[model samples]
Target chain A: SRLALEADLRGAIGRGEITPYFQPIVRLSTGALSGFEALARWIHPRRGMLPPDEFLPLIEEMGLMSELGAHMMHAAAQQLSTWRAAHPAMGNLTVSVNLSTGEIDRPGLVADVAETLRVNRLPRGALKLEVTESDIMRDPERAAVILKTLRDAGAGLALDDFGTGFSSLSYLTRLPFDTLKIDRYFVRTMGNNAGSAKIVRSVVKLGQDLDLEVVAEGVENAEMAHALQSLGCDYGQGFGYAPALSPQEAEVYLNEAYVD
Target chain B: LSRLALEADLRGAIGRGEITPYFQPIVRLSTGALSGFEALARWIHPRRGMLPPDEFLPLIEEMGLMSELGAHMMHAAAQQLSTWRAAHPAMGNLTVSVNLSTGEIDRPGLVADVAETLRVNRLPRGALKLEVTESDIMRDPERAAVILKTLRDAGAGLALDDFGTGFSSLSYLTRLPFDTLKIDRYFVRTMGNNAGSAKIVRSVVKLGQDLDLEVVAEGVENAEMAHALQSLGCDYGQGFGYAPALSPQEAEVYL
Candidate 1:
C-alpha cells in the first residue's frame, strides 16, 4: 500500500496536480457552519486519487515532505481566495491548513504567506495553520519562533491532535497559537469512556481559559455533538458533518443541507 | 487638576515675564558644533526655583489647555531666540524645534494661531519647527496634513518624529508632505552592537534619502554611535555631547 501510494503521490506532485475539498466544522448549538479545513486530494494521471493519510507518511519517509507541504499550502490559499470572492461574510470562515514541521523550516514560509495574502488581497485572519503536537516536541524554539512569525504576519495556528502527546505548559507559553483540535481518538470515545469525557471537559476548559477556540474531531453522533457543546467546544468536524468528500460532492453538500 | 493649577500659576508667571526658556544645544555629528537648541519649557514659579514641564504639561493637556500653554511656550522661546540672534549673527541660523500636541493641531483655528504667533513675535517662520508623532498623524491624516501644509506653506518645517517605531508609516509618508524625519531616540540609545536596530536605522535612513527628506538622529550620546550614523549619511544629529540647553546669554557665548 505504501509503495503504490508513493508512486501515485510522486507522479501527482511532479505534475503539480492538486484538488482541495473542504470538511466543514459546524457549531453544535446553532448547527451553523463555523469553518472549513482544506484537505489536499491528489489526482494522478494513471494512479487515480489518494487521501492525505495514504501518502503523507510515504512522502515524509521519502524526504519529499517539504515539497508536498508547499504544494498543499498553495492549493489551500487559492481555494480560500476563490471562496471569499463568492461570499464576503464566508470570508470570516477561516481555512485551516495542515502543515509539516519541515514547512516551518522552509526559508520563506512567513514571507510566502504574507505575499499570498497580499496577492489574494485577503485579510490575514482568514488563514490558519494546523500543526501537530509532535512537531513541537522535536524542536520547540525554532517552531515557536516560526509560529510567532506566522502570527505576526497575520495568520493563526491550531495545536492539532491535542491530548495525544506529552504537552507542557512551557510549550503553550512559547508558541502563539489560536485554536486547539482534540484528536479523533478522544472524540470516538466521548460517550463510552468516563476518562475520555473528563479529559475532553478539562481540555475544553483549558482552551477557554487560554482564550483559544476548541474544535473536536470525529464527532460522529448527536450525543458526542451535545457533549462537546455542553463542554463549550467551539466547533465539531467528522462523519456527522459527512466524511471528506470530493470537490464536486462537497460543493453539492455545502449547497444542500451541509450535514450528514 | 492639581498639576493644572500649578502650570496655570506658572503660565501666569511667564506671561508676567517671570519664567524664561532654557536652550539645550543640539550638535552637528561631523563637526561637533552647536547647530540648534531644543527649547525645553522651564516653569520658574515665583515661589519655586524651577519646575519641569513633565510634571505639569500632561495635567495642562488633560484640562484642555494645550493651545494656550503651547502658545505661551512659543512666545517665550521666540523672545529668547530673537535676543540670541540679535546678539550673535551665527546663532541666528539656529532653528528652534517645538513639539506640537494633537490638541493644538486638532483645533480649527490652529493654522491661524501658529501664523499669528510667528507674525506677532516678528520671528521668521523658518526658525520655528513642529515635531508631530506618528500616533498623532495616524488619527486624522487629512486634517493633520491640512494643518501641517498650512504651517509648511508659511515656511515652517514638519518633522515626522519617532519614525520606524510603528507599523505602516510608509503609506503615511505619501499622505503627508513631511520634510524631515527624526529617528526615535530608543534606536540610537541601543544601536551599538544591536544588529537589528542598526539595520533598521540604516534602512530608515535609506527611506529618507530616497525621498530627499532630511534625516536626523535624535539620541546620539557617544562618539561611536555618532560616527556610525554619520557614515550612514544621516543629515543631522540632535543630542548631548553638544552643550545642554542654556539661557540665551549662555548660548550666545558657545555660538
Candidate 2:
C-alpha cells in the first residue's frame, strides 16, 4: 500500500503535477515585497490541491525528497529569473526554496543549486535556500561543508524555524546563516504569552546583532505585523499578508504595491 | 487490521485495564533532585509487546475511550504518587503530572473525577498536576477555562504542555489557570545546534519567573542540555538523559 502511494507520487511528479506555489515575504515596516518562499503543492487530478502535509512524510519516508527538491529548485530558479527580467524594478526580489535533509546530505547540492541559477541566467543572490535547524544538525560536520559551499556560491542561506531547535550560542556565528526565519509557533503566541512575546523580541534582536535578516512566519493579522515591525523584525510571511498563490496570481500580486 | 477492528481491540484493552501508566522522573534542573514524575500512558497489548501512545491513541480517540483512559491513568497516578510520597517523606511536594486529553477536558465532571481520584487514594492537595496541551484549550476556550479554573480551585496544579506548538498558545496562557509551562521538546532537542533554541529556553525560563509559573524543559537528553537549562533557570525537566519511563517498582529507586 505504501509502495503504491509512492508510485503514484512518482507518476505525479513526472507528469508535472507537482508544482510550486509562491507565498510572498514582505518587509515588516513598509509591507514591501522582500521575497517569496516556494512551497511544493501536488495537484492531484482527483484530490485537488494536495497540501504537503498529506504527502511530504511519505516522500521523506520513500527517499524521494532529493529528486523532488532538485526539480523544485530548477522551477524556482526559472520562475525568479523570468520574473526579474520582466520587472526590472523588482531586481532585489529573492526566491527562497526549502531543501530537504536528504538533499542537504546528498552530494553536489551546492553544484546543483549553482547549475540551476546558471541555466536560468539568474544571479546567485536572487536565489535563497532555506535549511531548517534540524537539517543542519542532522550531520553538523557535513552540513557545515555543504552550507559553506552554498554560501561561497553567493546564494542567500536562511536558517528556517530558528528557535525551535536546541541551538548552542557558539554555532550562531560559526554557521553561514544570512537570515533567520522565526517559527510560526512563537509568532502565533507572541501577543498574549509573555514568554512567546519575549522570544520574538529576543530573536529579532539576536538576528540584528548578528546582522542577519529576521523573518517572522505565520502572521495572520495587522496586529501581529505591527508588533513584529515594532520589534525590529526585517520581514514576515503569513496568511495575514496573503496565502500562497499560483505563479500567474503571484505575478499579478507582484505588479501591484502590497497594502495591509 | 482495519481501523474499526483496531478501535474495537483498543476498546477491549481499555475495558480489561491493559492500558497502564509508565512513570518518567521529573527532576529539579539545578540539583538534579527527584522532584516529581509524569505519568505517560502505554498499552501492553497481548500481541504487541509494548506500544507507545502513537500506536493506539488515535484508536482510543476514535473509540471514545480518551476520557476512560484519562480517568484510569489519573487513578493509577494518584495511587503511585501517594506511595512515592509516603516512601520519600524528605522529598517535599512530590507531584505527579497526568496528561489530560481533549475529550477529558471537554467532558463535564473532570474536576470531580480528579478530586475523587485524590480522595480515594488519600493523597494530599497539590499532589497531582494536570497537563493540558495548547491545542486542547484552543478547541473550546470557554469550556477549558472553566474546567481548568475549577481544577485549580481544587488545589491541583495545572500545566500547559507543548507550550508553543499551537498558533494561539500565548493567548490561552493568560486565559487558562496554568501553574506550569513545559517547554516543548522541539526547542530542547535543537538547543545544542542552534543558538536561537538556547535563547528561547532562556527567555521562556525568565518568562516563567516573571509570571510566577514553574518551567520544565522536556526532552533533556544529555548533560549539556540539563546544564544549559539549569544555567537558564529552568525549574524542572525529564527526558532520556536521566531515564526513560519506568514501572512503579523500578521508579521507587529514583524516589
Candidate 3:
C-alpha cells in the first residue's frame, strides 16, 4: 500500500502537480506583510488538494525530496520575481522555501540555489530558506558550513519549528540563523494557558537578545494576533492572516496591501 | 577529524567493544522507589573524552549501524540486568529499557535477536523493556505493529518515548501495544512556567492511567515540577532533578 502511494507521489511530481503555496508572514508591530513562506502542496487529480502531511513522508521515503525541494525553490523564486515586477514597492518582501535534510546533504546545493535565483532574475535577499533544528542536528558541523554558504550567497535563513527539538539553547548562538520561527505548538496554545504564553514571551525575548528576527506561527484569530503583538513578537503567520494562497490569490492580497 | 572520519572510527570502536552502557535511574513518583534504569549508550573516545548520544547517534543512523548498535546495547543492558538481579534480589522485577532505533525495528529477526539476547544473559523476557520513539513507529505503521507485537508476545514491555512531541496521535496510541508512555522533556521542562504544558502533562498522565500504561515524565528539573507530577499521579520520572545518568560502578552506590 505504501509502495502504491509512493508511486502516486512520484507520478504527481513528474506531472508537475507539486507546486508552491504562499502563506504571508506579517510584521507584528505594524501588521504589514514581511514575507511569505512557500509551502508545498500537491494538486492530486482525484484526491483534490493534498497537504504536505499527507504525502511528504512517502516522498521522503522514496528519496524524491531533493527533486521536489528544487522544484519548490524554482517556483517560489519565479513567483517572487513576478510579484516584484508587478509591485516594485514589495521588493522588501522575502519568499522562503522549506528544504529537506537530503537536499542540504547533497553537493552543489548552494550553487543550485544561486542558479535558481539567477535564472529568475531575483536578488539573493529576496529568497529565505527555512530549515528545522532537526536538520541542523543531523550533522551540525556540516549543516553550519552549508547554511553559512547559503548566507554568504546573500540569501536569508530562518530556524523553523524552534522549540520542538532537544538541541541545547546554546546551539542557537552558534548556528548562522537570522530568524527564529516559534513553533505553532507554542503559538496555538498561548491563549489557553500561562505556561505556553511564558514560552512565547521568553522565546521572543531570546530572539531579540540574540538580535534575531522572531516569527510566531499559527496565529488562528484576532485574539492570538493581538497577544503575539503585545508580546513583542516581530512577525507572525497563520489562518487568521490568510491560509497558504494560490499564486493569483496571493497577488491579489499583496496588491490590496501595497499602497504603491 | 571530520564527522565522517569520526563516524568510521566509532564504528570500529563499536565492533571492538569500546562503546559502553551507562544507566539512568527511573524512580516511582509515588514512593520514590527505584523502578529501573534506562540504558544509554556512551562512547569513551580516548581523544574526545566521553561522547553522548547527540555526538554519535546521527552518524550511527547515517552509516546504517543502528541495528548493530541496538543489538550491542541490548546485550549490554541484559547483562547489566542479570548482574543487578543476582545481587539485588529485592528488586528482582526491575526492568532495563534499551532504546530501539528505527533501523532496529525494521531489521529482520529483531524479535528473535532480543529473545536470544535475554536467553544468553539468563534473564527473563520481562527483564528487558524496548523503548521506541513515536515518529519511528509511525514511519511504517504496519511493519512497526508486527515487530512490536512480536516483541510484546515475547514478554518485553514497549515504551513510547518522546510521546507528545511526535504526531501525538490518539489513533497510534490505541493501535500500538505500548506498556509505557514516556512524556517528552520539552513538556516537563516547561511545566512549572507553562500552564498549558502542565495541563498537557496532567492530561497525558490521566490518559496513560486510563489505558493501564505506565507514564514516566522526563526532564523533571525542579521540585515544583516533580511535586506537580506526583500530584497528577504520574507513575515515574527521571531527569537532572533526581540525578544525572551514572556509570555502572557509580550506579551501584545507589543500590
Candidate 4:
C-alpha cells in the first residue's frame, strides 16, 4: 500500500483527480444551510473512490498538499460562488476548505489561495480556510504570519477541531480566526457525560466572549442539534443534516430543499 | 456548588495541600504483584468530605488553576512514591503514574516540570509514568510527539489512555511514542454484563497486542474480572478489586 500510492499519486494529483465533496454546515437552530465544509475525496483508478481518511497522511508526509491545496481551493471557491449566485437565498454561503500544516507553513500557498479567489472573484467570507488546532500549534509564529497572509487576502480562517488540543483562552485570542470547531468527541459524548457537556458549554461561551463563531462538528441527532442551539452554537457540520456530497449531489440537495 | 465557595476553597486548597494525590494500585495480572500506582487528585474538603477531582477539576480548570493543581499532584505523587520506596522494600519496582490534563500539556514547561519533580524527589525519570488521553494527542499530534519523545527520552513511560472511547479512534494512533495502551474505564465497568462490551474489550486487548503495546485495564471491580483480564493477557489492572483510590495515609496501610 505504501508504494502503491507512489506509483500514481503525483500523476493523479497533477490531473486534478482528487475531488472535493461538500458537507452541509447548517445553522443549528433553524437547520438552515449556512455553509459547506469541502472534504477531499480520492478517486483511485484501480482501488475505486476513497475518502480523505484513506490517503490524507500519505499526501501530507509527501508534502504534496500545496499542489492539492490549490486543487481543492479552486474547486470549492467556484462551487461557493456558483451556489450563491444561482440561489439568492444562499447568498452569504461559504465553502470551508481544510488544509494540512504543510500548506500553512510553506511560503507562497497564500498567494496561490489569494490567486484562486481573485480568479473566482469572490468575497472575504465566500471561501473559508480550516486548519486543525494541532497544525497551528506546531509552529504558531509561522502559522500566525501565514494565517494573516490569507486572511488579509480575503479568506476567512477557521480553527478546526477545537477542544482536542492544548486549549487555553489566553492563547486562543492571540491567533487570528473566525470560527471555533468543537471536536466531535465532546459534541457526541456530551450526553453521556457531564464533563464533556461542560467542556462544550465552555467552548461555546468562550467563542461568544471572544466573538468567534462556534461550530459543533458531530451533530448526530435532532436532540443534539437542539442542545447545541440552546447552548448558542452558531453552526453544526455532520451527518445529522447530511453527509458530504459532490458538486452535482450538493446541487440536488439544494434543489430538493428549494422544492420544499 | 457555589462558584464563590469553589473558587476560594480551591485556591486555598492548592496552597494548604488539601488538593492531594490519592493512589489506585495497578496490579500485574500474571504474577499478582503490585506493579505501580496511578495517582489521582482527591480533595478532602473540610465541610464536604472526600471529594473526587470530578467535583473540583472542572471548576479548577475554568479558574485557570490547572497548572497549580497539576504541579501539586505531581509533587505529592513523586514524594509519596519515594516514601513508599524508602519505607517498604516489598513494593518492588513500583512506578507512580500521573495524568497530565489537556491544559497541562499545552502549557509551557511541562517537560521541565516533570524533570524538576523527579529531581526534587530523588527518583529516576522512569519512576514516573505520565498518562495522556487520546484526545489531547489528536489535538496536536506533532507537538504532542515532541513532548512525549522528550519525556520518554528522559525514561518516563507514556500511556495512550482511554483507548476505545472516541471516534473509533483506532486508525494510525500508535504512530506516537507510547509504551502502554489503557483500555477505557467504561469497558471494564460494562464488560461484566456478558454483553458485547466484553467482546469489545477482548478485541481491544488483541489490538493492543498487535500494536506491540502492553495493555492496562481500568475499573476492574471484582476478582472474576481480574482473573478474566489475567486470562486475556492484560499486563495490569486498576480499580475496586485491588483497592479504592486511597489517600496517602490509607495507601500507607497497604504498604
Candidate 1 shows a clash count of 4
Q: What residue runs in model 3 are displaced by over 4 Å at the alpha carbon? A: B1-255
Task: Output DockQ, candidate 2.
Answer: 0.02
**Model 2 pairs whose backbones collide:** A165-B190, A165-B191, A166-B190, A166-B191, A166-B192, A167-B190, A167-B191, A167-B194, A168-B194
User: What Cα-based lDDT does every candidate model obtain?
Assistant: 0.72, 0.80, 0.81, 0.79
Could you say which candidate leads in lDDT? 3
| DockQ per model, Cα | 0.01, 0.02, 0.02, 0.02
TM-score for chain B of each model, two decimals: 0.87, 0.92, 0.95, 0.92
Pull out the clashing pairs in model 1.
B23-B245, B23-B246, B24-B244, B24-B245
Candidate 2 lDDT by residue in tens digits, B124-190? 7778998878677767778778877888887788888876443423334545678899988988999
Q: Residue B206, candidate 1: how far off, in angstroms? A: 1.7
As a whole number from 0 to 100, the lDDT of residue A199 in candidate 4 is 64
Candidate 4 residues B2-37, lDDT tens each?
A: 867877777778898787788988888999877888
Off by over 4 Å in 2: A1-4, A258-260, B1-255
Cα lDDT tens digits for candidate 4, A97-160: 9887656876687788888888888878789999887787677677878888888999998988
Q: Which ten residues in a row have the lowest lDDT in candidate 1 chain B?
A: B166-175
Candidate 1 per-residue C-alpha lDDT over B34-118 given as tens digits, one digit per residue, 9 for 90 to 100: 6776777776676766777786667667666677767777777766667767777655567777777765767666666667767
Winner by DockQ between candidate 2 and candidate 1: 2
Residue A150: error of model 3 in Å? 0.7
Q: lDDT for model 2, on a 0 to 1 scale?
A: 0.80
**Where is model 4 more than 4 Å wrong at Cα?**
A258-260, B1-255
